């Protein structure tokens, strides 16, 4: 019985910790996700035509 | 001038549009310009064995052609460096990349073109005098141990027009120039030489000098000549590579060349870590043995076909130093890996296997590879005298000795040594079988051994007789329980046990016996044979007349003496001068005599 009580206590503690880290990760995301998706759009905009390197006629 | 890829299958690449082709002509393939060699041609098509793993070549890739076959570079700076199968100096790559990986097919020069070296002229050659190919004209000092010598390459002669004066010059700096018909042609200190072509010689010569062997065994029992051929087949576990290390470490030769065929980089790790530590002197100052050794590393992770090349480059290097007028002992490790690689290139090229899956021409190839050896007379006015010996290592497929490769190596070689699994299981280092092993050079060395030592034959004959008698009586005593045995049998088997556990057993890693000289070995064997003979005559006479000397009572009398005869190997010759050693041997001999007189 004491073991299950302590297990509940520790589960609550680690749940609080995990929520704290979740807050940290979402803060890290919102820091620069806009610049990141801007970089993604800059990348996908390119086309760069190129024939196959060693094709010969 | 160029070709395009058509297909690939691991280490082989079929190509197209390559009508201008010749087998054994170097080539380059892909955007990584991996080096290769033509092996098959038909129509405009061809095939190339590639010396680098081929994940990264697709169809249609360029195929550049050159006009020269596989070749290597000879000159100063080679000594003390490490090379791979196709002659890349590992130090230069590690410096250039500053990384711990091999990039696929790097184009580095074999010999650095940025280090200057002092040069000495011939002192007897003047502008206008005539010279023939094979004549030394310059001396460069690679290090204090070896004075590199350069000679005019073959197929060259005529009267010189200019020689570089004494001074410091690099490889690019032209040094020599000759004309023979009216055409001037320059010559540098580096020599381009095809690998598959034998270097010409003047004439062949027999063996006269013994090749030094560190172990007491394989020197007083199964010796090898300085210039002969040896084989060391042995199953796994024994790790005969350590025997190869012992051979390279200590030897009366001048230059030692080790090559690797599909072993682990750890073997390299021991040898490279240890050789700088080891040091020895000959005529004065002491120098590390790394200055007198060259390495050709090739681990199994390397490409398959590269191994054949590696062996061929090894024999080429040893041949060049043979022309130098020296003695060079090489030991090649795991030739079975070469045989497997040849099997694999053939099987991928889809020929018809002859025996055990291996090709139909392994025997001739191995015979030709071993044939490049012997003691010969060089071709030059300074009239050098060169010599080369080979120590090939065989890896039985599972310890079975009926494999075709083992039979071929036995049929070609002159000296054969045996390794037994149970002896290595005994921790009986080294595991010489002394039953199937034989040599064919004792007769040639008899002249030397008589001229210089004047007593080895009775010792050898009696030792062989004792070993044969013990081998005969082993299973006999097993199957009769040592019950009805004469005293002669007991003395024979126990002295044989003494010879086995003292004279044959030799831990080459304990400091006091890392190396043993010939004089100490013959002293040991003299002491043992004298003990055996005196015991034999004593027991014979006493049994004949009365009061038979059984083994138990003589053993009680001489337990102390046989204990000293067992512990006498504890000498440490580096800490013990030869004079003191022979004095102690005479002292033990007279002790044994005194005890035998005390009995009778």
């Amino acid at each position: 019985q004491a073991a299950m009580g302590s297990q509940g206590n520790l589960s609550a503690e680690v749940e609080q910790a995990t929520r704290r880290q979740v807050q940290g990760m979402q803060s890290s995301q919102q820091r620069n996700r806009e610049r990141v998706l801007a970089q993604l759009l800059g990348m996908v905009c390119e086309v760069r035509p190129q024939v196959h390197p060693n094709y010969r006629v | 001038t160029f070709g395009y890829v058509h297909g690939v299958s691991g280490p082989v690449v079929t190509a197209c549009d390559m009508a201008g082709a010749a087998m054994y002509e170097l080539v380059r393939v892909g955007h990584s310009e991996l080096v290769g060699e033509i092996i098959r041609l038909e129509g405009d098509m061809a095939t190339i064995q590639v010396y680098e793993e081929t994940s990264g070549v697709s169809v249609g890739d360029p195929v550049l052609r050159t006009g020269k076959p596989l070749s290597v570079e000879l000159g100063p700076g080679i000594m003390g460096a490490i090379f791979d199968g196709i002659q890349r100096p590992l130090s230069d790559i590690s410096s250039q990349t500053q990384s711990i990986y091999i990039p696929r097919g790097v184009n580095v020069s074999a010999l650095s073109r940025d280090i200057k070296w002092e040069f000495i002229p011939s002192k007897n050659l003047r502008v206008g005098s005539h010279i023939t190919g094979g004549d030394i004209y310059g001396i460069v000092n690679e290090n204090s141990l070896i004075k590199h010598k350069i000679m005019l390459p073959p197929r060259n002669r005529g009267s010189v027009t200019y020689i570089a004066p004494p001074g410091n010059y690099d490889a690019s700096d032209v040094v020599l120039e000759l004309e023979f018909e009216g055409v001037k042609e320059k010559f540098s200190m580096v020599q381009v030489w095809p690998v598959r072509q034998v270097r010409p010689v003047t004439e062949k010569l027999p063996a006269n000098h013994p090749l030094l062997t560190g172990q007491r065994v394989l020197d007083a029992l199964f010796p090898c000549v300085q210039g002969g051929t040896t084989a060391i087949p042995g199953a796994f576990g024994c790790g005969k590579t350590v025997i190869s290390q012992s051979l390279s470490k200590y030897s009366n030769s001048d230059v030692i060349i080790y090559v690797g065929c599909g072993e682990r980089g750890n073997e390299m790790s021991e040898v490279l870590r240890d050789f700088p530590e080891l040091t020895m002197e000959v005529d004065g100052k002491v120098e590390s043995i790394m200055k007198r050794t060259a390495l050709v590393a090739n681990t199994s992770n390397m490409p398959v076909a590269a191994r054949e090349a590696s062996i061929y480059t090894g024999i080429t290097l040893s041949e060049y130093f043979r022309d130098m007028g020296y003695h060079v002992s090489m030991m090649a490790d795991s030739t079975s890996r070469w045989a497997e690689a040849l099997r694999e290139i053939s099987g991928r090229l889809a020929e018809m296997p002859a025996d055990s899956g291996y090709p139909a021409y392994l025997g001739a190839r191995l015979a030709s590879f071993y044939e490049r050896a012997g003691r010969v007379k060089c071709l030059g006015n300074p009239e050098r005298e060169g010599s080369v010996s080979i120590v090939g290592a065989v890896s039985p497929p599972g310890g079975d000795f009926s494999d075709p490769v083992t039979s071929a190596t036995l049929g070609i070689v002159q000296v054969f040594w045996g390794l037994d699994k149970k002896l290595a299981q005994r921790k009986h280092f080294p595991s010489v079988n002394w039953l199937i092993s034989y040599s064919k050079y004792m007769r040639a060395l008899d002249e030397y051994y008589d001229k210089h030592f004047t007593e080895f034959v009775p010792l050898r004959t009696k030792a062989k007789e004792i070993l044969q008698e013990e081998e005969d009586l082993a299973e006999i005593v097993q199957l009769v329980g040592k019950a009805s045995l004469a005293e002669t049998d007991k003395i024979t088997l126990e002295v044989a046990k003494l010879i086995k556990d003292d004279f044959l057993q030799q831990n080459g890693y304990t400091p006091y016996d890392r190396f043993c000289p010939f004089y100490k070995t013959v002293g040991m064997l003299s002491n043992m044979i004298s003990f055996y003979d005196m015991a034999r005559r004593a027991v014979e006479t006493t049994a004949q007349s009365d009061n038979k000397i059984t083994w138990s009572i003589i053993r009680e009398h001489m337990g102390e003496i046989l204990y000293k005869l067992s512990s006498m190997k504890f000498k440490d010759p580096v800490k013990d001068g030869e004079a003191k050693i022979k004095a102690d041997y005479a002292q033990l001999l007279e002790d044994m005599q005194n005890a035998f007189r005390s009995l009778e």
């Binding site: 760069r48 190129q50 | 058509h6 297909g7 690939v8 299958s9 079929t14 793993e53 081929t54 994940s55 990264g56 070549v57 697709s58 169809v59 490490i82 791979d84 130090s91 790559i93 590690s94 990384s99 711990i100 990986y101 091999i102 796994f236 576990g237 599909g262 682990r264 980089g265 750890n266 790790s269 681990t299 199994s300 992770n301 390397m302 398959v304 497997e340 099997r343 694999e344 053939s346 055990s356 899956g357 890896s395 497929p397 599972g398 310890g399 079975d400 299981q425 005994r426 921790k427 097993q478 329980g481 040592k482 019950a483 890693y509 304990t510 006091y512 337990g559 067992s566 512990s567 504890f570």
Partner: protein, 461 residues
């Protein structure tokens, strides 16, 4: 960076066994990876093996089944197989192909590395000489395993090799005495799931699941992905060693299944056979699996391998044990006879051998009398076995005092030295003392493998 739109061809000109041929393929890329869309929609995968002209043979990882020459499609990547690596993968579980098993996500892959890897520069190698603390007397003292080495264990069916693996991964340490820990890596090779469950449970018993990179593969799964799994695990080990400065205890299991799968692939490809019908390049393949280990300059990390294997029919000359012995330095060879004698840990001490005594032991590391003690013990055990064989027929009456002494020494050796138990970690010093106590039965005279100085120094106690 590859800005090239992908391709897909439907020209399937045939199927034979686990192989598929694609005609009209444009500019094949050798050693490629392709994906296959079955008509019902199931996904499949493979790698291109051979290319010639406008044809491309391709082997399928999960096996040929249901493929239709007119309906299926195949699309081309243009790059060799590259696997996702990640340091956060520790504490996770995946199948052979790498997909999650525990309802975990697609791993966020710190880099993409070559599955085939790359060799290591020779000159960029440093020899390892640090002795590992295993806690087994038969290893520490006799066949001591050092860092940067790859000793396997030769075991047969029914032997307790799994418990030996458990002990060696649990009681790992350092003989030379900050904190230490070993990043376990393990991949199954089609073994029955009961052993997998036992290993999982023991790994929670260790209490460090956060350092357990685990992979799985069961017998019922397709056979041919077993060719891929160990290479992926080794790539992970490379990433965790030479990029994160960590020590990794890589361990495998059941290489016989790997050999069998490679054999089946080779038979499908009708290459030139060898001994017992095995492939010729099985040796080079095993070399690419094993020689990826050690430690290099500029890095404090290291790679240790324990690739335990099955040993059919208990035959030492069977090709797989032979070739594994050649490619490696050491061996253990757990014994069936000892396990039938009801003794644990049942490791035969004689056939075992370790080649790292040359630098792992000696003065300044453990002692100035380790090597001669071990040599004397080996010699005494071997001669004890020989006199036991002699006694098996001759009878005790005709023997001598030396024979009885050797038999008693053998009895003491087996009852005390080998008997170690399941959870009793023992130090090097205790094993040396135990060996000296065992050796004390013989008087000093007959000890022919000890120098005079050490014998005078240590024996009289």
């Amino acid at each position: 960076y590859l800005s090239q739109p992908r391709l897909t061809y439907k020209t399937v000109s045939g199927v034979n066994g686990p192989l598929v041929i694609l005609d009209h393929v444009k500019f094949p890329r050798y050693a490629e990876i392709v994906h296959l869309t079955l008509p019902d929609g199931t996904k499949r995968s493979g790698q291109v093996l051979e290319v010639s002209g406008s044809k491309a043979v391709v082997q399928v990882f999960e096996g040929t089944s249901g493929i239709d020459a007119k309906k299926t499609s195949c699309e081309f990547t243009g790059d060799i197989l590259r696997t996702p690596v990640s340091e956060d993968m520790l504490g996770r579980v995946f199948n052979g192909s790498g997909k999650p098993i525990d309802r975990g996500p697609v791993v966020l892959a710190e880099d993409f590395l070559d599955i085939m890897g790359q060799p290591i520069n020779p000159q960029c190698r440093i020899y390892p000489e640090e002795m590992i603390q295993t806690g087994i007397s038969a290893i520490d003292g006799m066949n001591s395993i050092a860092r940067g080495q790859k000793i396997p264990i030769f075991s047969a069916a029914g032997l307790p090799h799994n418990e030996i693996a458990a002990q060696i991964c649990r009681q790992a340490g350092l003989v030379k005495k900050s904190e230490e820990n070993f990043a376990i890596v393990f991949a199954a090779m089609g073994v029955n799931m009961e052993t997998a469950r036992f290993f999982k449970s023991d790994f929670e018993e260790n209490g460090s699941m956060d350092n357990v990179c685990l992979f799985l593969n069961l017998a019922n799964d397709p056979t041919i992905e077993r060719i891929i799994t160990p290479r992926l695990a080794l790539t992970t080990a490379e990433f965790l060693a030479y990029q994160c400065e960590k020590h990794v205890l890589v361990i495998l299991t059941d290489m016989s299944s790997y050999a069998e799968a490679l054999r089946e692939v080779s038979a499908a490809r009708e290459e030139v056979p060898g001994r017992r019908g095995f492939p010729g390049y099985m040796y080079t393949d095993l070399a690419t699996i094993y020689e990826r280990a050690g430690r290099v300059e500029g890095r404090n990390g290291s790679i240790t391998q324990i690739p335990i294997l099955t040993m059919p029919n208990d035959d030492i000359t069977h090709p797989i044990p032979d070739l594994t012995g050649y490619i490696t330095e050491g061996q253990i060879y757990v014994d069936r006879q000892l396990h039938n004698r009801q003794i644990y840990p049942p490791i035969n001490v004689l056939p075992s051998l370790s080649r790292l005594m040359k630098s792992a032991i000696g003065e300044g590391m453990t002692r100035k009398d380790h090597a001669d003690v071990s040599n004397q013990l080996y010699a005494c055990y071997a001669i004890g076995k020989d006199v036991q064989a002699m006694k098996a027929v001759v009878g005790e009456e005709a023997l001598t005092s030396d024979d009885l002494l050797y038999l008693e020494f053998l009895q003491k050796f087996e009852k005390n030295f080998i008997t170690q138990g399941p959870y009793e970690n023992r130090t090097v010093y205790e094993t040396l003392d135990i060996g000296w106590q065992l050796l004390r039965i013989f008087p000093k005279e007959m000890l022919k493998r000890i120098p005079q100085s050490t014998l005078s120094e240590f024996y009289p106690r």
